[PDB]
Amino acid sequence: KYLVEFRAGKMSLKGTTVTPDKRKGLVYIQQTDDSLIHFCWKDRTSGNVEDDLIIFPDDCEFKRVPQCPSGRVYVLKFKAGSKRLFFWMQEPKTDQDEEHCRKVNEYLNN
Numbered sequence: 001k002y003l004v005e006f007r008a009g010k011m012s013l014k015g016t017t018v019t020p021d022k023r024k025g026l027v028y029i030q031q032t033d034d035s036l037i038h039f040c041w042k043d044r045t046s047g048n049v050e051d052d053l054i055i056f057p058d059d060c061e062f063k064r065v066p067q068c069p070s071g072r073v074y075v076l077k078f079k080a081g082s083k084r085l086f087f088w089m090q091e092p093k094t095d096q097d098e099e100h101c102r103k104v105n106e107y108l109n110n
């Protein structure tokens with residue numbers, strides 16, 4: 001099972017052009033027996049996990065990006081490495097989109 005899970009796709013930079021990934025993916029957080037928190041992104045179509053990163057408490061911060069008019073975009077900033085990942089909610093309703101973001105932040109910071 002997962003502490004938190006929601007439908008969201010990833011994004012990539014095509015040089016100087018921002019381009020969203022049309023592939024459907026599922027973002028979820030799982031806790032291993034070692035008490036570590038793993039942030040993963042899996043393709044719904046293939047069911048394979050392409051992203052697997054180990055995140056420690058307060059290690060990263062998840063926050064909405066005001067720079068995107070959509071308002072459905074959230075970014076994960078890595079304190080160590082300055083790594084940045086962009087995700088966009090795929091749920092039809094935006095009412096619960098904010099709730100999912102908050103839950104993710106709590107697990108990452110707690």
Ligand SMILES: *[C@H](c1cccc(NC(=O)c2ccc(C)cc2)c1)[C@@H](C#N)C(=O)Nc1ccccc1C(=O)O
Nearest residue numbers: 011012013017018019020067068069070073086088
């Ligand atoms: C926010 C974002 C903000 C402004 C513009 C865009 N995308 C496009 O302008 C665009 C135009 C045409 C085509 C074919 C695709 C895209 C996006 C979000 C979203 N959605 C985003 O993806 N931003 C993003 C992602 C990764 C890195 C940087 C940025 C960024 O906007 O700077």
